[PDB]
RNA sequence: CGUGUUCUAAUUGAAGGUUUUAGAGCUAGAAAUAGCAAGUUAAAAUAAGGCUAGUCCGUUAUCAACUUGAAAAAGUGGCACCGAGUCGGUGCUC
DNA sequence: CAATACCTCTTCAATTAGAACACG
DNA sequence: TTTAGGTATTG
């Protein structure tokens, strides 16, 4: 006899219960525990609050790197293990000397100086080649034997840091000269293509190629230099091939198939020889000489210096920086010493001001220091050569910095190599392990192998050929690369929705193709002159057309049929077909695809050879690495000429199908012995579509379908919710609103409700790359014409101006950067149809009027003028595809009268499928009762209401939400949902198919939906009581019920429950604090003392415990009892529950009282003294938990006084609410005490309270608008939760935290249940 | 069916930052102090650690009390009416 | 004690898989 | 992307 209302969302999950008349009842429950109170009555409003759920993203961000770090120590390890045999004969302790190169002189067992022992020996390494790099170039450039321990230190130095693999292949260090080689590419080219020869033309191909300008702008600066060249020509594409890029020369060769090549890409040499063969191979020695430029070119940016002298540059490059720093160290120093030397210390002495030593000593970056001296060199004339060096960023540079991620591992491996080639003769074990040595650095576990699971890994994909230990030397054999390979991509794949044991075949499987072809033709009628009833195509008819026509052609047309087949062989001169549009929508393209490569049409049509054709397509779709694809394809290679294989690896498939294979041809009908395939083939008289086969009771198919949906019997609700997609913060709230339900039933005597109403409410760095890319492709200089930063792109008027390339969107003209206020932002889609602020709908144009009629998207006038202007942007990606489709709606037809009544539908009908699972789980869990017939029983009506429904209901009905007065409102939003949702299905039972879960004309559909919530309106002229005609049911009165909302809304008491969750996360702050004299620091490792070695700091504890015991005080060691809080941290937490006392006593507590060990999780709530309540923040911290119930008269006021969004109400009513705001003008001062009283009662914010007042009592002369939202600013103090600093309009108020947990313990502590109705109360005295 | 955003989840890799230690600091002076030469680099750890010792795992998710269970989760608390500062009373059941 | 105030790893790169959502 | 709990520091 009741209706439960619910309001879910990201953080809040409000609820409310309604009496038949929409009243909410007052019920009296018991109260457990020891306090004098044995029963307390509370009103049924149901409420909850909770922490925003955590994603798994940032957890993956660590879970990854922890495998990245530990394996980075396995790398340097295999160096030692191989080295530990010859290392021993040159030093006994050098290998343990890095092992303990962290500890202090005290704890450090072995000699302090690592490389040579005695400091005098080891100073020389530090003072001859201090930079490590200086060492590495020497061990390549010198042929004179040196210390093995020096050799290893260079080998580990590149393995620890190996470099990026975004460019794979081999480099030959003979891009010694870029300029000269080019004459050996062109020269190689000029001979190849005499008809148009080409000129060096005095070009500098180094400076005009190695300069740091854009990837595109350099071939430009080259082609302009070169004579008579196109860019997209064969040679401008090869100038674009060496600089790493995607350049398409097909237009020159007029190849049918596009071919964009890259050297960095894996399929470059295969992509070449399967392109080179297509051309004559004259083109090879034009090509591998282009590679030479890229290999020569690529090294350039890292080093612009001549490399003829140095075999190794990057290692060489940074020696460049030392002296480029060394000179500019003395120079700058000297320049301060010949002028201005009264501030020498701060730059050099002090590391806290961004001074250089601070720049080196202090934790300051390359950016900040450079920022510091920008005046200093600009107020110093001593150095002007340098000021240039700074602006380019080249000065006294660091040798470990951020841009050194652009370095390829092929010079790290390139300098590792020669050292082995330098000193292997004298060290025989080097050559015998050089491959091993290079195989650690060269190796990389690909993404698809999976972590080498030992079977003990949760995330582990890969199986193995053998069980012995995987090493980078025996990796290839041990793993099953394919077996591993399949798992990586198999797991994601969608399962059959009809069959969950059969995995789904790719989109391009023939059999899926056979179904797509067979079925579509299934429903075809054909008429001639002399047939009385148009008949279906029969078993022989259907088979033949496919047999000759479809294999034969990629698309099958209609007038193919009249002439190709009926006329050819059925012999109708003319025929009338009604099944299909102008061409069959179904293509055996996959069938078409095969022939080009296989070249044996009669092999495809062979039945025995079709399982290969289904295992090869799956093999091709699955993978994406051609080198890898070869493996699975040698299984069949004995069948084919080898030239097929080279072309067979080429075409790669993407996209997987919905439908399981066995279903297509394996689900057999016992009575009449055909598969789904066989059925679509021949049907006597009538050929069923697929959807018919699976739903005709006369066919056993569906009876064998139902057998697949149940088996397993679903999964438990926790298993179930987690699986469904969407926000992690929505699913964690999806789960709680059902536990609340099971109790809401459990409260009202397990009598299921009559209705359930549930509604769900609905970036700084990408905004600088969506723009940077386009104005490279769009080609403009508008970005360089005016620089802007990503710190300014959260205001759209500066955001859209650059997305529009500094030009209007409707009139074709430049725009001013500064007065972006006169310009007016416009919506591609009117707001009235649907509310949207998205950039895909947002745009900036000079005036709103120009686009078109307001009632429609911009009109035919502008799509003409501009369609071309909105192409390149789509073309350069500045706009987006969805944004465009609506942008050009003028010519389409536009928003028809059935279109505008479609968004108006979407506004008030929840089309969102994640609040359709929240619908389904409800009905199924509530209604387990079955009619004798197949039909179900629904004694609980599920309802979906959309935000706008209640969102409007308030501004028009005298009820205005204020989110920052209280945290009762989130629950209030369920009452309104409960009623209006039940006020609707009680007055319009027609709508039970778009408002209730469970199974042109639009010129009044517009009128049906835009009108429906009007029976709450007295005038517009409507009766005060409206009742449904059909059942005679009365479902509204505007005298009684409208007040029974206000009284349920006026209420002072509402259940608000911050959900008690145990905190779990990282141990402490990630930063590493220095060795300090406090016990607060946590040992980063067990064996290191934070007082000697430093460590992590300040972990928070998962749930605080209440310990009472006696602790020894003073010399006496006498023990006197105390009761306090020990918050258990998440590092001791794992060792706490194991034995609590044996742990607890280790921290000092003796004589410990066992049964009174009270675990108190986060957000725990105690009640003490005169009705004040508190929330446990932590062991030290309390949050402020006492709601202040806004009186109704006060609550309304905030929306009007604030006047949010200026005025959005009928202007005839803009008057009526205006006198009120000045009528109850003193309501202002009626808030202050009411505001104040809460502060004195519970908050104990007295110390800062005196300060809010002085700001208000001296701000009474300014207007209401300024003031209104500002008295709203202050409610964060009254709010639930932690205290936060807030500011009155011209002043800011600091927060007052709750530092101690002494106060709480004396007072009674309450465990409340999941809703707030069942309790357990305790008085904490003893 | 095609197209593209948005987000969700798993695998493989780079570059910083940081924490001690190794970079023989010197000259006066008893001495806290003041004078000057130096600085860019390397080692190593990057959640404690765990046992199943794998080149594995170690931050998601789930959490009233209470009874009972290894974990899952099953089980426990009258009805109504009049009122309204966070539940107060009344009447009945009991 | 609790009133005052500074502090909290970041920036990239490459590959798969799925819904949920909106256009032709 | 700014919260909100740890932590040395000051009147």
PDB file of C-alpha atoms in Angstrom, chain A residues 145 229 244 310 437 445 630 744 760 1010 1016 1099 1180 1214 1218 1284:
ATOM      1  CA  UNK A 145      92.927  -2.259 -22.902  1.00  0.00           C
ATOM      2  CA  UNK A 229      59.639  19.102 -57.948  1.00  0.00           C
ATOM      3  CA  UNK A 244      60.424   9.168 -40.681  1.00  0.00           C
ATOM      4  CA  UNK A 310      83.413   9.917 -33.358  1.00  0.00           C
ATOM      5  CA  UNK A 437      75.167  -9.423 -23.768  1.00  0.00           C
ATOM      6  CA  UNK A 445      58.571  -9.137 -24.097  1.00  0.00           C
ATOM      7  CA  UNK A 630      53.915 -16.373 -40.882  1.00  0.00           C
ATOM      8  CA  UNK A 744      13.210  -1.507   2.814  1.00  0.00           C
ATOM      9  CA  UNK A 760      20.158   8.656 -12.441  1.00  0.00           C
ATOM     10  CA  UNK A1010       5.635  18.838 -24.214  1.00  0.00           C
ATOM     11  CA  UNK A1016      -0.159  19.603 -11.861  1.00  0.00           C
ATOM     12  CA  UNK A1099      50.759   6.527   6.219  1.00  0.00           C
ATOM     13  CA  UNK A1180      43.521  12.160  15.011  1.00  0.00           C
ATOM     14  CA  UNK A1214       9.495  37.672 -12.975  1.00  0.00           C
ATOM     15  CA  UNK A1218      10.464  40.147  -6.969  1.00  0.00           C
ATOM     16  CA  UNK A1284      37.131  23.591   4.562  1.00  0.00           C
TER      17      UNK A1284
END
